[PDB]
Each structure stands twice: as structure tokens, then as C-alpha cells.
Amino acid sequence: AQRQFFGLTYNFYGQPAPLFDLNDLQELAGCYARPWTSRFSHLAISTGSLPVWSARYPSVASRNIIVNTLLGAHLNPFAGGQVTSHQGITWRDPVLSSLAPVPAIQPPPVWAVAENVPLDSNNYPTYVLNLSSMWPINQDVHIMTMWALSDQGPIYHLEVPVDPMPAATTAALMAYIGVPIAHLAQTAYRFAGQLPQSPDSTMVSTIRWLSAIWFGSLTGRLNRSRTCNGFYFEFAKPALNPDQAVLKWNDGARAAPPAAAQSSYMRCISPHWQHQIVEVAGALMSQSVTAVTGLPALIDEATLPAWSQGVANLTGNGQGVVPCLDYNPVPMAAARHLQWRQDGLITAAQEAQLNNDYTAYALTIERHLTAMLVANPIAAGRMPIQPFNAADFGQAGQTAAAVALAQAMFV
């Protein structure tokens, strides 16, 4: 199994301190005051389809964002090799089971506030010794890093090999017929969460294909007329249940494998993701695979924000550097609808209607978020939602390249 990881903390948006408060530290959905394996605890039991959010957690991404900011203040051991304390709170034990107020016996040194500190697991030898019990830290730290590197939306990775889907994976895949994407993401998070896993594994390869398949369906390139290996993702009408996309298996035609191996990094270029569940699910699912297998290659710095330029083990501009594409959901939906009518699943009249419906739906997301931002100014002290500008809702990004990749990916 993988024995070392690297990471990076969040970036203060001009504020002088990490953006969270003690109550946030007191109201995590998981076990008391522990951030590990908690990113889904707030929806383990569910009823209905309504998104879950609250006054001080007003967006679907809000809880994860807070958790990420929270971790930024306490990950010193992977930078300075020592446990520290911040505002009188530190870990219970070197295993980092949970956080607790500092005891008045051997108080650890006070943490020095900083941002965007690179992380290396080798700075903290006890992690290697207690790997069997500290394994979930690997996943969560990787997830935090994958979000910290972007100013606009989490980064994740796609790839498809030249060989057809191996039989063993197909056996594992069929267990997940007819389950929505959000549930799958929750399952994927749990898998890579509890115990250490070898990078080579049927389950690992299985999830990797799932990530690829969903993207192929997201562009509409994969549909019930053109399956990956019989598999594809079904979609409901965006006017109602716009997010209940589920996995389906079918006996129809299959797309031929690509000419060469395809792989790229992906990102959402518009603030819509902060309140749209499927983006979070897809990102987390892909990130889960990269967590256990590590990063296949460095990411291209070219399109990333300033603080992400040239991170030691994360970003680069050399030869073996995978580029990163970004897209906007609204044009993506337009492309997906266009594929459907070209493949003949719908008539042009419907395609016009679908675009109108989705655009109206997306507008509410923007309207909700923009109103929510002013209700939670970043200068207050905590950052429930990531800041943005109004123009960010109109950026097309590299969406055209994105669909081109999918067409080159499934062919």
C-alpha cells in the first residue's frame, strides 16, 4: 500500500487567520470533534431529495469547506514534525484521534499562523508506524489539497486505458446498478477511508472506471444508445430531480476503446458547484481514487491561481505534466442535449426546452449563492462559502475542449 503522501493547506483570502470558529469545531457531524471520515456524516441517514443545509452551513459544499479550513490550522506535524496547539486546542494523542482542549501538564508549543504550507508525511515518523490506524488521514489530507489548489472549484483526475474494461471490474461493477451518483460517492469515500489499500486492487480500478463513465455520460457522449461496456448514467428531466442521475446497464452498442491512453485533470470553472451536489459527488469520487493511488503526474500550473504556481509535489510546467481542463455546467448541459438529439434520443423541439429549463434552474443556484455570500461576509471570521464575483457565473472556460476530450475518450 501507499506509504507516503504530500499536501498543501488552504489560502487565506487576505484575512490574517484561518476562517473558522470554535463552534464549527464543536458541531461536526461525525464523532465529537474529529474531522476524519466525516465528510458524509451529515447525510448518512436521509429522507427525500432536498439538499441539506442550515443557517451557518448554507451550501452543500459549506461543511467540507469549513472542515478544510479547520484542518489548515492543525496539520503542523506534517510540516514541522511536531504537534502544536491553536487557541488552546490540540490533538488528544499522537495518533490524532480527535481534538481537545490543551491539558495543563505538558502544553505543546503554540502554532505559528501561516498559509499554504506544503505537507510531507515523512516529517512525522509515527504515522508510518501507526499506518493501520492513521490511514483515513491520508484520504482527507489529499482531499483538502485537491480543493486548496483551486480558487474556483475542486480539481480531480480522469483517465481511460487502451484496453477494454477488465472482466474482474465488470464483476464488481454490477453490484452498483440503479444507484444514484451521490450514494456512489458516499460509498467511494467510505472505501478508501477505513483501512489501507493497495494501489492495485479490483475495487480501486472499479471506482476509476466509474469516474470516467460518469464524465462520459455528463457530456452526453455516453448514453443508452452508446454504452461504455453496457454501463451508462441515466438522467431525469432538469425541471425536477435535476440531480438524480443513476447508473444503468444495457445490452446496446458499446463505444470502441480510444486510440491511445487518455488522461487529464478536471475542474469546475463557475461558482455553481458550491450548491450543486453532483459536482461535489463527482469530484470526491475521483479524488478518492487519487488518494489511494497518489497523483499519477504533476498538474499544469498555467491555468491555476497564484498561490498554486509551482507547488513542490503538486504542480509543475515540465514535460510529464498533465494539463487541466475546466468547464461551466450550463454550456455543458447544452452540449449534452445536443448529443442526445444527434444520437436521436430527443427531437430538436425538446432540446430547446431542456436548455431553457436548465438555464432557469442554474439561475436559481446563482441567485441563491450570491444572496448567501452577503449574508456571510468573509471578514466575519469564518468562510462557509468561497468568495466569487458576479462575472464568474458567465465564464465558459475550456468547456469546448472538455467535450472534445470525452469524444476522444469514448469512441
Binding site: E27, L28, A29, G30, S41, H42, L43, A44, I45, S46, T47, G48, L50, V52, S54, A55
Partner: protein, 149 residues
């Protein structure tokens, strides 16, 4: 009659429910200060037409569905049309009412006119008004309601 209805044991206007622990005088039928959180005020929520409630897992406390068909946090100010109460008194009695007794929330019951009734007490000895209200809640059903005490 519309000007002298009080003489027929009928009152007009809405009803408030706020935990108040007074030591001096008290006059519920003739308030002196302006009522708080009039409908449409800031952070004032009106219940949904079904009065349904939704649970949450692992520490997260339940939420209430407003007219906008959106779950909302129970704490704060809320407005109950009488009809919604008449069909959801049970869930109200089980979730909202305890928060009221904790003084963490305030409720306005909307009802144009109603029959009221009075209960006098000695201001010297101790008293708690909660049981009377809890009894009054227990007798509400979809059909009708008892007079307001």
C-alpha cells in the same frame, strides 16, 4: 358588535407565545409594548402549508418546512396559521413547544378572532403557566379548538 365584541367573550387579533419570567405586573389582555416580530419582519418564518418536519442524522437537529418548501432551523421566530396547527399539533407539541419553553424561539399564532377565557391567580405564591397551555394544546384537533386561556 364589531366594536364591543369583548363583552361577548370574543377577542380579535393574533396570539403570541414567548417565555416571559416577570416579577412585577402582568397584563396579557392589554399589552403596553409593541408586539415583536410582526409578520414579514426580518428573520421571521411562516410554516409550510403541511406543517411537516424533517429529521437529520448524527447530531444535526431537525428542521421545519416553511411556505417556500424549504427546511429551516427551528430556533428563531415562527408564524403558525391556525389551520396548520390544527393538523400538526402533535409534531408541534413534540419539537417546537420544548424550544419555546427553553426561550430559544418565539411563535405567533395567526387567528383572526377567537373565544378567550381567563384564569386568575394569587400574585404572591409561585406559578408556572406551562401546564395550562400544554393541556390546551392537547385538546386541539382538525375539527376545532378550545377557547384561548
Amino acid at each position: 358588535f364589531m366594536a364591543e365584541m369583548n363583552l361577548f367573550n370574543v377577542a380579535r387579533g393574533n396570539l403570541y407565545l414567548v417565555q416571559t419570567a416577570t416579577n412585577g405586573n402582568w397584563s396579557p389582555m392589554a399589552p403596553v409594548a409593541a408586539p415583536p416580530f410582526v409578520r414579514g419582519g426580518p428573520n421571521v418564518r411562516v410554516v409550510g402549508r403541511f406543517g411537516t418536519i424533517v429529521p437529520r442524522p448524527d447530531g444535526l437537529e431537525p428542521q421545519l418546512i416553511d411556505d417556500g418548501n424549504v427546511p429551516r432551523d427551528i430556533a428563531g421566530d415562527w408564524v403558525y396559521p391556525s389551520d396548520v396547527l390544527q393538523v400538526s399539533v402533535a409534531v408541534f407539541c413534540d419539537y417546537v413547544w420544548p424550544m419555546v419553553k427553553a426561550g430559544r424561539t418565539r411563535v405567533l399564532v395567526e387567528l383572526g378572532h377567537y373565544v378567550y377565557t381567563l384564569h386568575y391567580y394569587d400574585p404572591q405564591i409561585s406559578l408556572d403557566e406551562a401546564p395550562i397551555l400544554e393541556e390546551w394544546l392537547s385538546k386541539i384537533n382538525p375539527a376545532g379548538i378550545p377557547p384561548v386561556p
